[PDB]
Design a protein around this ligand. Sequence first.
Ligand SMILES: NC(=O)c1ccc[n+]([C@@H]2O[C@H](COP(=O)([O-])OP(=O)(O)OC[C@H]3O[C@@H](n4cnc5c(N)ncnc54)[C@H](O)[C@@H]3O)[C@@H](O)[C@H]2O)c1
Ligand SMILES: NC(=O)c1ccc[n+]([C@@H]2O[C@H](COP(=O)([O-])OP(=O)(O)OC[C@H]3O[C@@H](n4cnc5c(N)ncnc54)[C@H](O)[C@@H]3O)[C@@H](O)[C@H]2O)c1
Ligand SMILES: NC(=O)c1ccc[n+]([C@@H]2O[C@H](COP(=O)([O-])OP(=O)(O)OC[C@H]3O[C@@H](n4cnc5c(N)ncnc54)[C@H](O)[C@@H]3O)[C@@H](O)[C@H]2O)c1
Ligand SMILES: NC(=O)c1ccc[n+]([C@@H]2O[C@H](COP(=O)([O-])OP(=O)(O)OC[C@H]3O[C@@H](n4cnc5c(N)ncnc54)[C@H](O)[C@@H]3O)[C@@H](O)[C@H]2O)c1
Ligand code: NA
Ligand code: NA
Ligand code: NA
Ligand code: NA
Lengths: 334, 335, 334, 334
Amino acid sequence: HMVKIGINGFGRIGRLVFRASLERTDVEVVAINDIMMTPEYMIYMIKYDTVHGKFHGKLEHTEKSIIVNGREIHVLCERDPEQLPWGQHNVEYVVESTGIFTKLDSAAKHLKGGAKRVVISAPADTPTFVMGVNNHEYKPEMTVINNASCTTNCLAPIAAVLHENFGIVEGLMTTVHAVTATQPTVDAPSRKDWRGGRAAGYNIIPSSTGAAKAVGLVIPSLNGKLTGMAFRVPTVDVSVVDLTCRLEKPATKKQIDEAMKAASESERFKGILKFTDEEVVSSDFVHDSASSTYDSKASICLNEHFVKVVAWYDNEWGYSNRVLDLIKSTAKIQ
Amino acid sequence: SHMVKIGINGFGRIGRLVFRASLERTDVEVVAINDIMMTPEYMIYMIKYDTVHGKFHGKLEHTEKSIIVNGREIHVLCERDPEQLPWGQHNVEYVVESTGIFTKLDSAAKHLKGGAKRVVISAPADTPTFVMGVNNHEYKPEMTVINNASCTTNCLAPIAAVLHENFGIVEGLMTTVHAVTATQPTVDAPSRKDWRGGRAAGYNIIPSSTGAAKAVGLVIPSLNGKLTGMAFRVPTVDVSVVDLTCRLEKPATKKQIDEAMKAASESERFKGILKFTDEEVVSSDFVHDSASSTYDSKASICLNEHFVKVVAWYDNEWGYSNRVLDLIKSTAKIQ
Amino acid sequence: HMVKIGINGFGRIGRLVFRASLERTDVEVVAINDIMMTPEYMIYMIKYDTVHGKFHGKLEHTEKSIIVNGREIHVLCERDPEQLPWGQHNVEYVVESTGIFTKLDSAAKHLKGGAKRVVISAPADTPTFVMGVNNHEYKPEMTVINNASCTTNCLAPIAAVLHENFGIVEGLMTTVHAVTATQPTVDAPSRKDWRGGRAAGYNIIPSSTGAAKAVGLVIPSLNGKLTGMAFRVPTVDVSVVDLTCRLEKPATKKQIDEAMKAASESERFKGILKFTDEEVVSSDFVHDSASSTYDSKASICLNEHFVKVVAWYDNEWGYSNRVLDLIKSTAKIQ
Amino acid sequence: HMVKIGINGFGRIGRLVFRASLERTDVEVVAINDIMMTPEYMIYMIKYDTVHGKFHGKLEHTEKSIIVNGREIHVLCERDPEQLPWGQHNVEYVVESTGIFTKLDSAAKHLKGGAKRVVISAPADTPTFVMGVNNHEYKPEMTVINNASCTTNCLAPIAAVLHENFGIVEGLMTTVHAVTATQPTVDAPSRKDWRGGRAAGYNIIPSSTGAAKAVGLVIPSLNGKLTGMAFRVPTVDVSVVDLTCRLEKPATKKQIDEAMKAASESERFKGILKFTDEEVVSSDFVHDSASSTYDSKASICLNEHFVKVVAWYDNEWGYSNRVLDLIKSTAKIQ
Ligand SMILES: NC(=O)c1ccc[n+]([C@@H]2O[C@H](COP(=O)([O-])OP(=O)(O)OC[C@H]3O[C@@H](n4cnc5c(N)ncnc54)[C@H](O)[C@@H]3O)[C@@H](O)[C@H]2O)c1
Ligand SMILES: NC(=O)c1ccc[n+]([C@@H]2O[C@H](COP(=O)([O-])OP(=O)(O)OC[C@H]3O[C@@H](n4cnc5c(N)ncnc54)[C@H](O)[C@@H]3O)[C@@H](O)[C@H]2O)c1
Ligand SMILES: NC(=O)c1ccc[n+]([C@@H]2O[C@H](COP(=O)([O-])OP(=O)(O)OC[C@H]3O[C@@H](n4cnc5c(N)ncnc54)[C@H](O)[C@@H]3O)[C@@H](O)[C@H]2O)c1
Ligand SMILES: NC(=O)c1ccc[n+]([C@@H]2O[C@H](COP(=O)([O-])OP(=O)(O)OC[C@H]3O[C@@H](n4cnc5c(N)ncnc54)[C@H](O)[C@@H]3O)[C@@H](O)[C@H]2O)c1
Ligand code: NA
Ligand code: NA
Ligand code: NA
Ligand code: NA
């Protein structure tokens, strides 16, 4: 009946995918692997959250399990995903959220232990999906997929509405992004992203992202039409997309607002793309499960063909919820 | 002449840093300071310690009505109303109007009543607007009250000038990711004119309005109506960054754009005002960098030869404060 | 049937008192004054909160009121408390939380408007109360009282337990305190308190507090036995008391832990003084209504007569609930 | 002539010891090992410093060295210290600042590669030194020593002064401490210190420190008379000690200020312990090379036996300068 899930990497995304799994009855986490955590430590990690507040529910552990609201969840213990006995616990989907196995060569190792399918919680050299955008393109032969990046999940629904209604001639994207675990507290090594090693809480930090190019993977007609970059800034969670586009068809501000609003009420995007015309700031989206919230009042245009659209996203919570949505969506496809 | 004598109204982030910078050059001196929330004793403390630009090194003393900085007396005034300030009495030629509350010509002009000769408003204002390196030569000697634009306009306009003169900017949209400033509160608090702006500064990304990009069309008139923009205030204590997305008329390869910026940074016109980097910089790398604008070639990107996103950094406190003094020096030569 | 409350100063305390008032059926806010807010602005302020999250109910407004979960609350915008029409809306208690009427002379002006009693949300030259500590000392002739400071409400219950069980010979307190509205975001003027003008988010800032001296006002036998200081540090909310004591009688760690735990379960301190033995940090107390949470793991001693007790407090939410508690407590006294 | 130094672990302490070494002609760094940095990345990390500002000089690199102000410094990449060829570069002292070789046996591994002496940049169970307090107890058989913690270097001079003038009967210390590299930017694993895993920039975090006990080793008569703890708070650098102690001989505030002032002017403590009576905050000590600055205005007493002394320290810069001072001091002893 329920889709049984294992989590590899019980981190920000792993633990919030876990929390979200507790709030819906169609999906459940039955096993967790994190080589940095014992069951008693996992319980501590679940219980308290700087961003998303305290867990409310019963938490206990055994030597090899945690017990959440009276339900046993098996705690595995292997550094090497090839050694994880997912099959022993009837795990159908593994959420690959360590941040270190985002290549197909790595993520596929979960299959060896009998997981049926893997969702990588990051861009990867695998089929890429964004709920509301291309999740219906999933094919049952695909055993390893990814849910793209948080930024892609914010941008793609916005781009979809813009392109469908007005046509994106070309776009340049900036995302102003909260800190994440990849950044250090002080100036420290980060050999693949130099700027990314600078003290996270005390700098605006340019970062590369592939989100805007990536949108061509989920909206093929936008391939080659977007590119972008990022600034990491000192906030603990919630990020924002700043998408500057030339549009083919003229759009009044009212027409863009109305298209976003319509989209947010549509079957396709309900709960994924949201709308606001209020005077919001980033903390207002903490624990908002949208992939994207269009900010009517912050979005501007120079003229009817050149616009800057602003869209908010809880990079932790929205994405985690989308991971579960993608598991549910694709699980019906056998 | 020999030294332009300056009075500072509002001894705040900009006022005190204009003061500090004035000590580093011999062609200008501050001879009077007015700040309604400070005593001479308090002013010395303000000068001495600075969370961002570090400790003052130099001698600081005060009297009942003066501060003494490296042995030199600076008169401390005390008037809430600019109309009351005896600037002429203290031989003040230029007033730096940096309170943040007299950015209207109607208020800032009142410094003239007390005998100041010229006034430079440290903010956008309904007056002639200047950005050093871009239009300071358009200054006319009859311009008695002028402004030095915003920190953001001072960062954006040099970039826009280089792009426009080389390739022609058809249209542009600007975002600035901006450090917090005194206008934001530490906790969610009233801001009746800018609601978002009342939210806790240190804990939010806050969209904010800015006329900086439109203002570029005032300092570069052929760009009037071709630019607009906005801001996100983020939790950094100082240093901000401009993100200009524009369509170019002539094609520009990345190399061309890189070369244009570099050549501009070396030119007499922009030297020290527009700088160039190709290094992996982040915002704190520009703390106490007196540039108006540092072009970031590695962070700047483009989609094609007519559609580009240029990234440029500015110490919103220190670059601006130095440009205020540059503007004073420049315009003082025009009588 | 229900104590009717007016709020003067709809700030961090004012708005959170208001939120707290929605969760209990024995008090209700029927009028709000704030000179910086239209009704429209007031519901914005309620709706979104950087620290305590978005309002979960429904908000509307009129030209003269706000409507909160369908209940109309009259709204005012009058600078002078003497001019507030509290009586016309049958306000019994006024919460004086502007921060600028913290003197008997000023705060008493509310009674001229027909309010019956006033609770000043800060130390003042009025009878001073701390729930759980001296609130039963209230006398019906006391028409203007105060609820002390957030720090006093944290320190006093901890001090009470220590002093009553073991006797405090002497105590020296430090509070590591979150930033508040009294601090600026950049180095700015603060003529009365020079350090207090320094950029709040980028400094550890020594500050003077009266809290430890204040505890003599609610625990007379401790008068002259405590003093202390504060460091303001860059957190948006939640503070912690660090109280170093010489005890008259010896106390083992166990005895201190169990005395605090017992106190936390007593009817006297239940919900006021709480206990933890978990690995908590400050964000774990965001929206914790305790005045004080004794931290058993963080508290240390050198020996049985020399201890350092650590106690957490949400300086916004704890105190705000205590204001409603004090109103409730004293209203019974006629 | 100069003492030739190798640095193992080119992190916050490593790099700042390096910068400080350029400002004095009696010591020079000739070799650097960091397993997370190429020479190219190394000069980036020197060039830009979030806290201490841009390197003013010019940097280049080769495949095996960095060039600083025209001078070649050899770059090693060995995870295992026993494989580091210090002797080949005539390295006398190794600064062991990786944070992971803080044991006698691990730090001694540098001797195998031909280093003559090792200074561990951290608490260790080795001979422990605080400049100004016990550096003259160094003996030449001590080939592996440590320079204590930043906190011990702040506290020890303060304790020495109190104890020598008034006698410390007992003391409890808190340090309110800047974030360091051991803390993550988001809630992350910290198996041996649960609280230390919580998001650094968004919490007041109780932490343990052995500084107070350690002062008992550096000042033997204080053994067993001090203990303490820490709160990590969101600042990028600079920390403060809050020492609450009981004095044997009664002391007035005046007598304490005068003792601290006299000490600060002594040959023994000049540049090490400083004195202020100004309204300072933590950023005022950024790049202040003192081990300790006694804050006369913030320090308080309850009575003449019971005092709370506040002392500031740039935990990065003061400490890094002390490392070089200790090397200079002990190098003379052969
Ligand atoms: N944080 C975000 O905002 C966000 C949003 C969307 C996607 N992502 C992506 O999700 C992934 C995880 O990100 P995060 O922020 O949750 O990271 P994180 O650092 O919070 O969590 C990673 C977890 O993996 C664990 N781990 C490490 N090696 C492991 C191994 N061999 N086996 C098992 N567990 C292991 C770590 O102990 C840690 O708990 C990354 O790919 C990241 O890019 C992050
Ligand atoms: N901080 C920046 O990054 C920056 C950059 C460029 C321009 N500006 C502009 O410069 C102006 C000042 O900005 P700031 O950051 O220095 O502000 P600030 O709040 O730091 O300084 C304002 C100062 O004015 C004083 N003051 C207030 N009323 C006064 C009066 N009646 N008479 C005299 N002094 C009075 C205050 O006491 C304070 O010292 C504003 O217009 C601001 O927009 C700021
Ligand atoms: N913030 C805390 O953690 C805390 C805790 C306990 C007690 N307190 C005390 O409570 C009081 C309020 O503190 P706060 O943090 O909520 O401050 P705040 O600045 O957030 O709120 C003050 C409010 O009063 C309003 N106001 C100002 N003048 C007014 C007037 N004449 N009439 C009506 N409204 C007016 C302001 O517009 C603002 O909304 C202070 O005395 C403070 O010391 C604060
Ligand atoms: N940061 C402070 O304020 C401070 C002050 C005094 C002492 N200390 C102590 O000094 C030490 C270093 O602290 P830090 O803040 O500089 O840490 P850091 O994380 O900034 O620096 C440690 C460096 O060691 C490198 N490293 C790790 N393993 C290595 C190995 N096997 N070989 C070579 N290099 C390796 C890392 O790549 C990193 O650059 C710790 O013991 C710390 O407790 C820190
Ligand atoms: Na479930
Ligand atoms: Na000068
Ligand atoms: Na109620
Ligand atoms: Na040297």
